[PDB]
Structure formats: structure tokens, C-alpha cells
């Protein structure tokens, strides 16, 4: 297809009033009988009807009960009762056959066949284990039957499903079940009819058929309505659903208290799917989850995966209002529901777990994955202007930066002002398909606030850079002068970047008071120009606390002495800025040691001793009593390597890895006695946040106690591995052991495989922990694991567990190019059956320009090999075309 543009939107020529679907479900060939009740838009001349349709085996076309034949050269001579198929497979009916009056309704009935077992794209109807499941977002419903496959077309649905009674005892679709019984002529088959009373776009359609067990629990809304919440899964996993069920109940209660949102259906169903591209999908009343985001068990699920399940479960329920009842006018507005819903699950996770812990996790993920995207060839604003394949723009920018943009609304307007904007947003657009500007206008109108410049967050890509050009205390005036500058580098298709509306939370820590001296302690500064000076009231000499709570998704250039950083590490009040001060000091040490290693390529690299400021602060955090142990663990943990690499030019993952290990080993020697004392204090599975924090700090201290990677380190990690009562401490010890070549690593990996007992999720970790190992010939191990009996590229979770994890290994960038070729060979094979996963796999080649010339030539070679592959998908073609946009021709 050709490139699509945001400003080319136009309402549809025709409307869809009713959808009558009949499914004759078989694993090899499913018949889909569909009747669409349509009419032309008012005040519009007659025009041809064009319906989306992809990979359908068409049997018959019927217009108002009259059969139409396939247009051919023989039908041209005389037959006018014909239909046509365009070059893309869309169903075309000439305007002469349709009613002349616009309001006159007509019926288009089609019989098509699809092949679920051959549907390896996992879009539309396909087989997943013992289940027949669906996935339609964004444009997958056209792979089931003909439709106007766009989110601004809504209609009422009536769905009938017929299937084998033994293989598919449970049949599910959107809405309420109105009929169930046996198939009349065919013995052994049964059916069910589902009617959705509320109109919905086609991407929210879903159907499930297979052998399912369920747990359930009632929920009473604030109006008194009772909603039956049920979690479905295959029989073998039906005892691992309580954590997901309890998460739905918390999400429904939280949305009522925090935003006044009330569920409107009698049933809320969640079905687990073992073969799923996304993490979960918000199909109206019939959510479908990836198994890794639903199933939970103490012996298989880590604390982080437990929290991720709670977060995604809430995310999918929050889509019922921000996504389903108020939906998108077009796919350029994807961040209207994704950015707003991610922000909603971030507030939810913060209230359910720890606010500071969640904020630190979100910022670290943003400044690694999203910052790389925003500085690369695929950089796009949260509301893109153009796209080729819409599946390529379900990105960290649209999701996670979009949430940071929503959070900036909350910062500028306050909680009560943000709530008033939400109420007006839901009141105006309930049951409609709207845009980003509608949400921004709701926030503006409800608060009397001008948000015209704020739209630049939606229009301009790239990470803004905020420089602290001057920050000096003025004792004569009792003022603190703060001068700030902002600039944003060019991104593909947009060189000039106009100033953003940047809210910057600041604070001052008095040098005498050792606490906040501002009242209120945090002040929201509105940086709206390219350069601006602010004057804060400071009674005494102070130290600046800049960008508290990460109030804007920007880079910060702020020169601080190690003494002022140590002052903030000990006396700052903002939880993020307190951690940011420690993260800033450790990042600079990591970055400098990596540049020394990068200068000599590891040939005689001598590191200066770690400064006492860093070690004493590390020791104080380690020995501290009474504080939150999760904040303790995240402060002591070394900075994420992908985050530090985004500040380097060029990026050298091997130099950054050696820099990380050298710091890990030096602090392990300097504070070995204190580390061993705290480690023994954290011994002796509960889901309580107190026990999660204890295990989190215990695993971090083990990392600092095993840096030498000698026989003593392997023995300590092996005991941690064997004595673990859950997956959290077991997987952490295994991950540490896999960097230590020896018998302890092989024994742990062999035992880990057998202890899985065929569990696909535990086997994913077994593949991933090997792909991320810092061992020699880790590439050859990954290449060999592709032949393993339990490896199949057709399952996205298993493919990502091995291949995607390997792309995050620093040895993936080995200068011999063996790692790049491995990914390219994988992307080529996967693209022939699952374009979505292959396009995301090829994304690891996007930042080729940021690496050294040797790695540039190797990555450019694989990028061109993929781009020149015959039959390459539209999805993967767009990704590598963008990557090669700034590359030499030929
Ligand atoms: Zn989603
Ligand atoms: Zn979402």
C-alpha cells in the first residue's frame, strides 16, 4: 500500500447498521456467513461500495437476496448483476446496483472460508493450543469477513458460533448469549448466539471456542448492578487464575473511586491464550490475554511478573472507558486511548503497590526503550503524521511517552482539574469515535486553560533537552535565580522543533535546614520559551532539586559537584529526585569508565578508585533501617545499561558491560562485610509488598556479592538457587550463575529445565536466561538452541524468549557480525508467516548510525539483506526502509 496521511481523513461513504455473523467452526476450514445491513451517508451522491477483505476464500455474494456473479470478460457480454474484486481483494459493488436514495438500507450477504490452523499471522481467526481465538486490532477483522475495517465505523453485532461439542464445549463472543442448543442436522455439534446491545467498532470483536475452565466472582457496581467477572483458561492452567481475578476486582473498584467510571455490562470475561502477539487485548466484554500476563503461581511466577499481571489486567479494564465507550476516530489517534490508559494503569499500580517504585520503573523504561526510538530513524510523535503499516506504531512512544504527556496534563492542571477534564471528556464523547484534539479541548475547556502550545507534544517527535544554564543563590535579595534553555534535535521529516510547553517541578534544599525551603516544597515551573529565567524565594543558601517526579519526558543538562549530589542523595524530599541524584552519580561513573574502555578497546584500561562520595552513600543506603527496601534495592542497583548507552556516542555495549562489571566488583570488595551482614538479615511465599521488597533487596545484594564470578561466587549463587522457595529468588540466582562458566551453571540450567515439567512459561525463562548469558560462544549457544525440540518460531513468546532476549545481550553487537546475521536470518524466516513479530525483531537494527564504523557496515549489510528479500512483508519493509532512509543508496 501507499503511505497514509493524518490530514487526509474523511468520513466513510457508507454506514453499517447491523452485522449478522454465522460461524461454522473447524480447525482446517471455517465457514463465515455474514450479512451487512448498510446505507449511504446523507447528502452524498451514489458511489461504489468498497469493503475491506484479506485472504478470504469467497464462495457467494448476495445483494438484497439476489445473487451476484464474479465480474469477468464473459460477464461483460450483458450481465450487470456482477460484483468485482480490486487488486487488493476488496469487495466492490457498482453504484448502479445500490439504492439511489442515501437513507435506503441494503443487505450484502457473503459466504467465505478461512483457515485458522494455517493462520500463523495470529490476526483474525486462528488456533492457539486447544482454542480457537481471534485478534482484530488494528485491521485484522478484514481477515475474517468483509467489513469497513476502520474504528470510526460502529454497529450492532449478532454472532452465531457452531463447533464440535467435544472439542469446543465453551463458546464465547461479545455481548450476552441469547440462545444455545444442538445443531439440527449435524449430530455432535452445538451452537451459541451472542448479541451485543451496544455498537462497537470491528477491532473490538472477539470469539473464543475450545475446552475452557473458569473461576468467577460477582462485583457490585456503585449503581447496584451485579457483574459476573470470569477468568477462562485451558483445564491444565485453571488453578492459576486467582491473582488475575482479584486484579479485575481491584481495577473495577479503583476506576469507580478515582475516576467515577462504572462498568455497563452484565458480564466481564477474560480468556487466556497461549499464542498471542500482544500482551492482552481489550475486546468488549471478552478480553483475551497472553498467558504470560495472566497465569500466576508462586513456583513459576516472579514478583515482577506478579505486578505486571496486576498492571496489565487493570490496563485492559481501563480500556472499557478510555478506548471502548470512547474510541478512536482513526488509527492516527491511537495514543488517545493508549497513552491515556497507560497513565491510568500507572496511577493504579502506584496505588496498589508503591508509587515511587513504579515511577522509577516507568522512567527507567522510558529513558532506555523510548528514548532510543525517539532518537532513531523510526522517531515519530505520539500522534503520527504518516504510516504504512499501522501495526508498526504500537510503540513505546505512543504508549509510554503518550502516558507521560497525559501526566503533564495532570501536572499543569492538578488532580481536581484533571478530574474535571476527564468528566467532561467522558460526558461529551461517550459512544463516539473522537481524536486527540477532543481530549485536549476537554482539558482546556473544563479548566479555562489555554493548551494551544501543548499540542506540540502531539506534533513534534524527539526528546527535548533542558539545560540548567544558571542556578545561583542571591543572598542580598533572598532569591534563587534559575535560567533554563530547551532544544530538540531534528527527527525524520521534521528538522525545526518549536519550543514545547514543559512543566518542570523544582525544589530547594537549604544548606543549613537540610530540608525543603519552598512553600509548597515543590513548585511547577512552566518552561514555554527557548530560554527562560525564573526567580524562586530562598531564605537561605540552597541546592537545586531539578525535575522532581520526572515531570517532563526530557533530557537534563545540569552541572553539579559531587558534594551537591551527595547533599541531595541524603536530604532531598522527592523520591524520584533522591533516586535520580544517586542514579546521576552512578551513571557518570559508568559512562566515564566505558569511555576509557572504549578509547583503548580494553587494551590496558586502568580505572580510578571509586570516589568516597559514591561508596559512602552506597554504604549508608545499604545499612539503612526503616526505609522502603524496594527503594533501597533500586538505589543500590547499577544504572540500566540501555539507559547509559543512550547518553553515549558512539554506543559501545562491550565497553559499557566491562564498566558495569568493574563497578560491581569494586563495591563488592569495599563493602563485602556489610553486604554479607544485610544479606543474612533478609532470609526467610507471601504476596505482601513487605516480602516483595525484602526479596528484591536480597537479590540485588547477591549481585554485588558475586561479582568476582569465581568458585566462591558460584557456590553462593548455587545455594541461593537451591534454597529458593519461589521463582523470584530462583531465577535471580540462575541469572547470576549463567554468567559464571562452570559446573554450577550447567547443573542449575539442567535442573531448571526438569523443574519446569513442560511449563511453556518456565521454558521461556530457560531459553531467555541462556540468550542473555555473558559467556563465551553465547552466540553459538543461541544458534544451536534454535534446533532445540522445545523451540518453535510459530509461538511469539518462545521466539521472543530466545531471539529477542539475545538482541539485548551485549555480545549481540560482536564486531564479527555473527550476532547481526543470526537476527537477520531469524527475521527473514519469521516474516514469511508472522510479519508483526519480524518487524519488531528488525527494529534492533534501527540505531545503526550510533555505533562504530565496523558495526555500522555489518548492520547496514543485514538491513539491506532484509530489505532486498523477495516477498518481504509490508510491516518489516517499513521498519528497515525507515532505518535505511539516512543510509547510503544501493
Ligand atoms: Zn492494549
Ligand atoms: Zn492498551
Amino acid at each position: 500500500p501507499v503511505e497514509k496521511h493524518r490530514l487526509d481523513y474523511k468520513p466513510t461513504d457508507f454506514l453499517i447498521d447491523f452485522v449478522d455473523l454465522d460461524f461454522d467452526l473447524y480447525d482446517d476450514r471455517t465457514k463465515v456467513t455474514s450479512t451487512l445491513t448498510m446505507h449511504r451517508r446523507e447528502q452524498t451522491p451514489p458511489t461504489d461500495l468498497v469493503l475491506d477483505g484479506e485472504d478470504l476464500e469467497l464462495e457467494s455474494v448476495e445483494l438484497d437476496g439476489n445473487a451476484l456473479s464474479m465480474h469477468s470478460t464473459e460477464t461483460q457480454k450483458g450481465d450487470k448483476r456482477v460484483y468485482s474484486l480490486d487488486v487488493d481483494g476488496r469487495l466492490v459493488i457498482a453504484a448502479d446496483l445500490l439504492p439511489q436514495e442515501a437513507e435506503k438500507k441494503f443487505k450484502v450477504k457473503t459466504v467465505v472460508y478461512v483457515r485458522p490452523k494455517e493462520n500463523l499471522q495470529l490476526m483474525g481467526l486462528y488456533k492457539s493450543g486447544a482454542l480457537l481465538v481471534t485478534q482484530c486490532e488494528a485491521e485484522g477483522f478484514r481477515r475474517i469477513t468483509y467489513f469497513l475495517d476502520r474504528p470510526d465505523v460502529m454497529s450492532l453485532f449478532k454472532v452465531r458460533l457452531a463447533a464440535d461439542e467435544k472439542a469446543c464445549p465453551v463458546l464465547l463472543s461479545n455481548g450476552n448469549m441469547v440462545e444455545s442448543g444442538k445443531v439440527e442436522g449435524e449430530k455432535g455439534r452445538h451452537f451459541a448466539v451472542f448479541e451485543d446491545p451496544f455498537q462497537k467498532p470491528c477491532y473490538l470483536f472477539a470469539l473464543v471456542a475450545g475446552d475452557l475452565k473458569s473461576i468467577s466472582q460477582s462485583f457490585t457496581t456503585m449503581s447496584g448492578r451485579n457483574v459476573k467477572v470470569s477468568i477462562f483458561s485451558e483445564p491444565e492452567d485453571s488453578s492459576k487464575l486467582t491473582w488475575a481475578l482479584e486484579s479485575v476486582l481491584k481495577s473495577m473498584k479503583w476506576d469507580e473511586e478515582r475516576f467515577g467510571r462504572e462498568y455497563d455490562l452484565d458480564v466481564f470475561n477474560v480468556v487466556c491464550a497461549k499464542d498471542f502477539n500482544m500482551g492482552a487485548m481489550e475486546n468488549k466484554g471478552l478480553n483475551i490475554f497472553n498467558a504470560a500476563l495472566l497465569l500466576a503461581d508462586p513456583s513459576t511466577t516472579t514478583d515482577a511478573e506478579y505486578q505486571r499481571i496486576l498492571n496489565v489486567v487493570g490496563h485492559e479494564y481501563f480500556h472499557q472507558w478510555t478506548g471502548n465507550r470512547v474510541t478512536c476516530r482513526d488509527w492516527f489517534q491511537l495514543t488517545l486511548k493508549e497513552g491515556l490508559t497507560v497513565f491510568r494503569d500507572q496511577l493504579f499500580t502506584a496505588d496498589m503497590c508503591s508509587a515511587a517504585v513504579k515511577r522509577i520503573e516507568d522512567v527507567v523504561f522510558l529513558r532506555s526503550r523510548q528514548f532510543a526510538e525517539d532518537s532513531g530513524p523510526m522517531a515519530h510523535p505520539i500522534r503520527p503524521e504518516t504510516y504504512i503499516a499501522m501495526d508498526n506504531f504500537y510503540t513505546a512512544t505512543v504508549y509510554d511517552k503518550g502516558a507521560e504527556v497525559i501526566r503533564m496534563y495532570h501536572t499543569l492542571l492538578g488532580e481536581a482539574g484533571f478530574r474535571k477534564g476527564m468528566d467532561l471528556y467522558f460526558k461529551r464523547h461517550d459512544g463516539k469515535a473522537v481524536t486527540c484534539d477532543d481530549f485536549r479541548a476537554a482539558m482546556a475547556d473544563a479548566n479555562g486553560r489555554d493548551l494551544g502550545q501543548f499540542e506540540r507534544w502531539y506534533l513534534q517527535a524527539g526528546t527535548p533537552e533542558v539545560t540548567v544554564s544558571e542556578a545561583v543563590f542571591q543572598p542580598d535579595r533572598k532569591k534563587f535565580k534559575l535560567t533554563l534553555k530547551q532544544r530538540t534535535p531534528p527527527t525524520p521529516g521534521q528538522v525545526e522543533k518549536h519550543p514545547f510547553h514543559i512543566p518542570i517541578k523544582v525544589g530547594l534544599i537549604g544548606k543549613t535546614s537540610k530540608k525543603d525551603i519552598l512553600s509548597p516544597p515543590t513548585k511547577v515551573l512552566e518552561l514555554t520559551e527557548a530560554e527562560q529565567t525564573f526567580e524562586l524565594d530562598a531564605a537561605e543558601d540552597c541546592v537545586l532539586s531539578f525535575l522532581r517526579d520526572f515531570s517532563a519526558p526530557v533530557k537534563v543538562k545540569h552541572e553539579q559537584t559531587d558534594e551537591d549530589i551527595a547533599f541531595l542523595m541524603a536530604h532531598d524530599s522527592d523520591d524520584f529526585a533522591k533516586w535520580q541524584a544517586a542514579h546521576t552519580l552512578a551513571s557518570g561513573l559508568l559512562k566515564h569508565r566505558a569511555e576509557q574502555w572504549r578509547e583503548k578497546q580494553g587494551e590496558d584500561v586502568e580505572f580510578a578508585r571509586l570516589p568516597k562520595i559514591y561508596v559512602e552513600a552506597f554504604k549508608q543506603t545499604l545499612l539503612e533501617q526503616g526505609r522502603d527496601r524496594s527503594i533501597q534495592a533500586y538505589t543500590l542497583r547499577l544504572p540500566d545499561r540501555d539507559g547509559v548507552a543512550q547518553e553515549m556516542e558512539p554506543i559501545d555495549p562491550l565497553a559499557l558491560k566491562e564498566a558495569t562489571e568493574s563497578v560491581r566488583r569494586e563495591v563488592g570488595q569495599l563493602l563485602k562485610s556489610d553486604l554479607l551482614k544485610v544479606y543474612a538479615s533478609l532470609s526467610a511465599e507471601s504476596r505482601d509488598q513487605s516480602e516483595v521488597s525484602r526479596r528484591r533487596l536480597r537479590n540485588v545484594i547477591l549481585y554485588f556479592l558475586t561479582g568476582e564470578r569465581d568458585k566462591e561466587a558460584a557456590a553462593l549463587a548455587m545455594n541461593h538457587f537451591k534454597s529458593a522457595k519461589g521463582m523470584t529468588e530462583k531465577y535471580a540466582a540462575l541469572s547470576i550463575l549463567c554468567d559464571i562458566e562452570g559446573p554450577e551453571r550447567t547443573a542449575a540450567l539442567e535442573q531448571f529445565y526438569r523443574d519446569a515439567k513442560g511449563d511453556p512459561l518456565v521454558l521461556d525463562k530457560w531459553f531467555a536466561v541462556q540468550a542473555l548469558s555473558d559467556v563465551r560462544q553465547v552466540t553459538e549457544t543461541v544458534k544451536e538452541l534454535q534446533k532445540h525440540a522445545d523451540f518453535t518460531a510459530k509461538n511469539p513468546n518462545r521466539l521472543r524468549a530466545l531471539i529477542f532476549s539475545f538482541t539485548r545481550n551485549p555480545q549481540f553487537h560482536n564486531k564479527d557480525g555473527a550476532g547481526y546475521a543470526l537476527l537477520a536470518d531469524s527475521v527473514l524466516a519469521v516474516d514469511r508467516f508472522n510479519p508483526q513479530i519480524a518487524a519488531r525483531g528488525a527494529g534492533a537494527f534501527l540505531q545503526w548510525k550510533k555505533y562504530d564504523e565496523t558495526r555500522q557496515r555489518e548492520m547496514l549489510k543485514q538491513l539491506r539483506r532484509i530489505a532486498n528479500a523477495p516477498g518481504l512483508s509490508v510491516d518489516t519493509l517499513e521498519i528497515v526502509q525507515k532505518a535505511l532512509a539516512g543510509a547510503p543508496e544501493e
Side-chain angles (χ1 to χ4, degrees), residues 1 3-9 11-42 44-73 75-76 78-79 81-95 97-100 102 105-116 118-119 121-165 167-183 185-186 188-197 199-212 214-298 300-414 416-513 516-558 560-598 601-602 607-608 610-611 613-615 617-619 621-624 626-648 650-676 678-687 691-710 712-724 726-779 781-783 785-849 851-888:
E3 202 152 352
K4 303 79 145 162
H5 300 262
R6 173 179 72 97
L7 299 189
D8 287 339
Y9 173 82
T12 58
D13 293 329
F14 296 88
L15 284 314
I16 296 188
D17 296 294
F18 199 83
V19 197
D20 201 313
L21 301 174
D22 189 10
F23 284 92
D24 204 16
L25 301 169
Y26 291 93
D27 286 354
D28 63 306
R29 203 161 92 112
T30 288
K31 189 203 293 182
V32 186
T33 304
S34 178
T35 291
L36 309 172
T37 304
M38 312 182 65
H39 73 265
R40 204 171 71 252
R41 185 168 297 276
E42 57 171 281
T44 292
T47 187
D48 292 358
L49 168 68
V50 191
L51 297 168
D52 301 300
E54 179 178 316
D55 288 329
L56 311 172
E57 300 172 30
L58 178 54
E59 182 178 84
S60 50
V61 177
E62 219 168 297
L63 175 66
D64 290 326
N66 306 127
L68 305 177
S69 282
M70 176 76 180
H71 181 275
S72 69
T73 319
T75 66
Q76 262 300 107
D79 204 338
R81 301 184 184 184
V82 294
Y83 69 90
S84 43
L85 299 177
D86 78 329
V87 79
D88 296 312
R90 303 186 214 273
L91 181 58
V92 181
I93 295 182
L97 305 178
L98 305 169
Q100 288 284 314
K105 293 187 183 181
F106 59 97
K107 286 176 170 248
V108 172
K109 178 180 178 179
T110 53
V111 176
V112 302
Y113 297 93
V114 292
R115 301 191 179 276
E118 294 177 20
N119 190 9
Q121 297 182 11
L122 315 193
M123 292 292 297
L125 179 63
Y126 69 95
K127 192 75 191 303
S128 159
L131 308 180
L132 286 163
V133 301
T134 53
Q135 170 65 33
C136 298
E137 171 160 51
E139 304 171 333
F141 187 84
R142 65 184 72 182
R143 300 178 53 80
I144 299 181
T145 189
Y146 296 99
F147 208 78
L148 295 178
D149 197 349
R150 25 194 299 177
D152 58 342
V153 172
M154 313 179 219
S155 161
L156 302 172
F157 275 71
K158 179 180 174 179
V159 180
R160 176 179 185 269
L161 310 173
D164 188 73
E165 188 179 347
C168 307
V170 183
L171 309 167
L172 289 171
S173 196
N174 317 90
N176 314 294
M177 182 202 288
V178 281
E179 190 185 13
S180 265
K182 314 294 197 181
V183 174
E186 314 152 45
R189 299 173 67 77
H190 68 145
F191 72 93
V193 188
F194 292 85
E195 287 185 351
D196 200 334
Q199 55 182 19
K200 62 160 175 296
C202 85
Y203 81 93
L204 287 175
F205 168 80
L207 80 76
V208 181
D211 190 2
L212 288 164
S214 78
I215 73 175
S216 74
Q217 187 173 342
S218 183
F219 178 82
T220 298
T221 71
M222 50 194 197
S223 290
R225 182 214 300 269
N226 273 31
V227 176
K228 180 180 171 178
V229 175
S230 320
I231 317 285
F232 293 85
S233 84
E234 294 185 14
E236 68 262 30
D237 312 306
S238 53
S239 63
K240 325 171 186 173
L241 313 180
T242 53
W243 178 254
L245 173 61
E246 295 171 357
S247 294
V248 181
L249 303 170
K250 293 179 195 163
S251 317
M252 289 181 297
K253 189 68 212 179
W254 182 91
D255 219 10
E256 283 187 344
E257 302 179 344
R258 193 73 184 264
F259 290 99
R261 292 309 100 191
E262 166 165 33
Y263 197 59
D264 58 302
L265 284 320
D266 275 348
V267 296
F268 182 78
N269 289 327
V270 175
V271 177
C272 166
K274 292 175 183 289
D275 304 81
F276 214 60
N277 282 332
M278 304 169 67
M281 180 59 208
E282 70 266 22
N283 312 293
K284 213 171 185 177
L286 186 53
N287 292 12
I288 300 181
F289 274 60
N290 191 305
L293 282 314
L294 200 79
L295 306 187
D297 178 77
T300 68
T301 312
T302 69
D303 282 331
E305 294 170 337
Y306 260 105
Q307 194 220 84
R308 195 163 77 248
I309 291 174
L310 170 74
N311 175 262
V312 174
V313 158
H315 176 100
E316 300 303 323
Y317 173 71
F318 302 153
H319 260 318
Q320 175 59 27
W321 265 105
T322 60
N324 292 4
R325 291 193 63 162
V326 184
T327 183
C328 291
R329 191 198 67 179
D330 52 78
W331 290 125
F332 293 93
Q333 326 291 329
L334 180 62
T335 200
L336 169 64
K337 72 180 173 86
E338 293 310 327
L340 182 49
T341 303
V342 168
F343 177 65
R344 265 145 66 73
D345 72 58
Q346 286 172 353
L347 300 178
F348 172 71
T349 294
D351 287 340
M352 300 297 107
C353 307
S354 169
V357 173
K358 172 61 165 170
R359 191 84 186 111
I360 292 174
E361 290 166 3
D362 294 330
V363 171
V364 161
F365 181 85
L366 184 86
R367 298 203 292 210
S368 70
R369 262 67 151 206
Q370 201 277 326
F371 273 18
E373 190 174 61
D374 231 355
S375 75
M378 256 289 289
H380 55 283
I382 63 171
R383 183 187 62 195
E385 295 300 334
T386 65
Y387 67 80
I388 297 176
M390 187 47 208
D391 291 319
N392 274 336
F393 286 78
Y394 286 69
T395 56
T397 292
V398 165
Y399 272 68
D400 304 300
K401 171 170 177 168
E404 302 288 319
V405 172
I406 301 299
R407 187 177 295 266
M408 279 188 292
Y409 284 109
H410 187 272
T411 297
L412 288 164
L413 307 167
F418 187 84
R419 171 66 186 270
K420 196 188 308 154
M422 294 285 288
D423 296 339
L424 184 56
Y425 171 68
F426 293 131
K427 176 184 178 61
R428 285 175 170 175
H429 310 299
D430 192 359
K432 294 123 163 55
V434 296
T435 70
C436 290
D437 296 329
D438 284 311
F439 177 83
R440 183 166 49 84
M443 289 285 158
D445 296 350
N447 290 278
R449 188 70 167 269
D450 168 44
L451 296 171
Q453 191 180 356
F454 198 84
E455 195 194 355
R456 284 170 182 166
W457 289 112
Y458 292 84
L459 297 143
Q460 301 188 146
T463 309
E465 180 196 272
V466 174
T467 297
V468 179
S469 48
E470 180 167 31
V472 51
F473 176 62
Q474 297 166 321
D476 302 338
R477 304 193 301 123
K478 277 196 166 70
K479 299 279 192 173
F480 189 87
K481 183 189 175 187
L482 183 59
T483 307
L484 305 178
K485 297 175 176 175
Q486 68 160 294
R487 68 158 293 272
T488 304
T491 60
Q494 181 181 108
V495 176
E496 191 166 35
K497 305 286 186 176
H498 306 299
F500 298 84
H501 189 164
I502 310 178
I504 296 181
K505 289 178 180 175
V506 297
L508 297 178
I509 309 296
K511 286 172 176 170
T512 304
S513 92
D516 280 300
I517 65 174
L518 293 178
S519 289
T522 299
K523 180 173 177 182
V524 177
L525 301 180
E526 300 202 28
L527 179 59
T528 59
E529 320 297 317
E531 181 179 336
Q532 207 160 340
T533 297
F534 305 86
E535 304 230 282
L536 309 168
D537 292 313
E540 58 179 72
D541 201 7
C542 35
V543 178
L544 175 63
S545 182
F546 194 66
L547 206 68
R548 289 181 163 184
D549 198 53
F550 199 67
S551 61
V554 302
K555 295 185 176 62
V556 169
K557 277 181 168 170
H558 185 203
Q560 299 166 283
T561 67
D562 282 7
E563 282 289 340
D564 285 1
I565 290 172
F567 188 76
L568 287 175
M569 278 195 292
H571 306 297
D572 207 344
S573 52
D574 179 71
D575 280 324
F576 177 81
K578 193 176 197 117
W579 168 90
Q580 177 58 51
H583 182 267
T584 299
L585 176 62
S587 303
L589 293 164
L590 271 203
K591 203 189 67 174
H592 181 60
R593 288 194 174 192
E595 292 166 346
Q596 294 183 81
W597 208 100
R598 182 192 62 195
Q601 268 303 294
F607 295 129
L610 291 166
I613 289 293
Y614 171 79
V615 183
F618 194 103
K619 180 183 181 180
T621 306
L622 170 66
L623 303 173
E624 206 167 17
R627 276 229 314 177
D628 186 283
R629 290 204 182 104
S630 280
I631 300 298
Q632 259 182 306
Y634 281 1
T635 303
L636 296 176
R637 187 196 305 278
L638 292 185
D640 183 90
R641 291 175 333 232
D642 292 319
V644 177
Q646 285 309 305
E647 314 187 27
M648 293 169 32
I651 293 178
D652 200 316
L654 293 185
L656 196 43
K657 187 57 158 59
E658 293 286 351
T660 300
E661 297 294 331
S662 73
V663 176
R664 165 201 192 183
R665 287 192 300 268
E666 192 175 330
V667 310
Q669 292 291 102
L670 287 175
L671 308 176
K672 179 167 172 140
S673 180
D674 298 307
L675 287 160
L676 289 157
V678 179
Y679 179 72
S681 81
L682 304 168
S683 270
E685 181 137 289
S686 160
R687 295 292 98 217
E691 283 298 281
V692 175
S693 283
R694 181 184 57 83
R695 290 186 290 266
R696 185 131 59 190
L697 179 57
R698 183 165 186 260
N699 287 338
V700 165
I701 294 164
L702 174 69
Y703 173 85
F704 289 113
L705 281 167
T706 58
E708 301 305 319
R709 290 191 274 175
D710 49 9
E712 183 187 12
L716 180 68
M718 180 60 103
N719 285 319
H720 192 113
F721 175 85
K722 296 185 298 175
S723 65
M727 188 75 268
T728 299
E729 290 165 305
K730 188 180 185 178
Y731 196 46
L734 176 68
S735 177
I736 284 161
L737 278 168
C738 284
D739 292 338
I740 310 168
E741 289 175 44
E744 298 87 350
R745 176 187 190 273
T746 309
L749 281 178
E750 261 155 39
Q751 174 184 332
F752 190 86
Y753 182 90
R754 277 193 313 280
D755 292 1
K757 289 131 56 184
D759 196 298
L761 300 178
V762 187
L763 290 183
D764 290 339
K765 292 203 236 304
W766 183 82
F767 276 98
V769 76
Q770 296 176 90
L772 285 163
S773 303
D774 187 20
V775 283
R776 301 165 313 178
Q777 333 296 333
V778 65
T779 304
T781 299
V782 167
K783 207 193 298 182
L785 281 168
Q786 283 174 307
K787 312 179 200 168
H788 197 275
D790 283 329
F791 175 74
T792 171
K794 273 69 182 180
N795 182 278
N797 282 27
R798 186 55 49 84
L799 174 71
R800 288 187 288 241
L802 177 64
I803 296 302
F804 279 40
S805 303
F806 175 65
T807 61
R808 297 173 244 122
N809 194 303
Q811 288 201 51
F812 161 74
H813 294 276
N814 270 5
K815 305 177 105 165
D816 63 340
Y820 301 146
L822 191 148
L823 172 65
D825 291 353
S826 172
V827 167
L828 287 181
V830 174
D831 188 77
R832 308 192 170 102
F833 59 86
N834 201 337
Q836 257 189 40
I837 310 300
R840 292 163 206 270
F845 289 129
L846 280 166
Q847 285 197 300
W848 58 269
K849 191 154 186 61
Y851 292 81
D852 59 75
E853 146 169 309
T854 301
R855 294 180 169 99
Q856 283 194 11
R857 288 154 137 81
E858 293 295 330
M859 290 173 64
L860 283 176
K861 195 186 71 178
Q862 308 296 343
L863 271 170
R864 290 178 173 180
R865 181 153 76 95
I866 297 160
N868 289 123
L872 190 70
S873 72
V874 173
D875 295 45
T876 307
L877 183 55
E878 174 174 35
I879 295 304
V880 304
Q881 271 213 1
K882 293 278 176 55
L884 291 166

